[PDB]
Amino acid sequence: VTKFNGLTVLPPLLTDEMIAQY
Amino acid sequence: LVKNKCVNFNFNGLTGTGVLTESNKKFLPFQQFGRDIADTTDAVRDPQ
Amino acid sequence: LIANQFNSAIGKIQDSLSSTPSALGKLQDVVNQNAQALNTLVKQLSSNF
Ligand SMILES: *[C@@H]1O[C@H](CO)[C@@H](O)[C@H](O)[C@H]1NC(C)=O
Numbered sequence: 140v141t142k143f144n145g146l147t148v149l150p151p152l153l154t155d156e157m158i159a160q161y
Numbered sequence: 162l163v164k165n166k167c168v169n170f171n172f173n174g175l176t177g178t179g180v181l182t183e184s185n186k187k188f189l190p191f192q193q194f195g196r197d198i199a200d201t202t203d204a205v206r207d208p209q
Numbered sequence: 210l211i212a213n214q215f216n217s218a219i220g221k222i223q224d225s226l227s228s229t230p231s232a233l234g235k236l237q238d239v240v241n242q243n244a245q246a247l248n249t250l251v252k253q254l255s256s257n258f
Contacts, residue, residue, distance in 0.1 A: 144254065
């Protein structure tokens with residue numbers, strides 16, 4: 140699986156490490 | 162020119178606002194500025 | 210026999226995921242769709258209206 144003009148991408152609450160831990 | 166400071170800049174009429182840094186990307190001699198995939202300026206060759 | 214079959218099935222799943230490029234179709238499609246929506250929204254500024 141594969142700058143800002145007013146946009147912003149908020150990071151997910153659960154990081155990929157935490158999702159892998161789950 | 163001022164680097165690492167958010168300053169309105171005017172290079173050859175670019176009139177863009179942002180912060181300036183030394184860029185590792187290379188430019189061809191005739192090219193004067195670069196654009197992003199979204200048609201927004203992201204690099205400027207200094208005319209002076 | 211069942212343990213060997215399960216291990217072979219897991220290995221085959223790994224090999225198919227590694228080889229077939231379009232396996233992650235749904236996630237790739239959702240990411241591409243969201244990126245395209247954002248790109249068209251950004252390009253919408255150049256519109257004269
Ligand atoms: C004049 O502009 C040119 C642009 O190529 C630059 O190289 C040069 O340093 C500038 N100043 C003088 C005094 O020539």
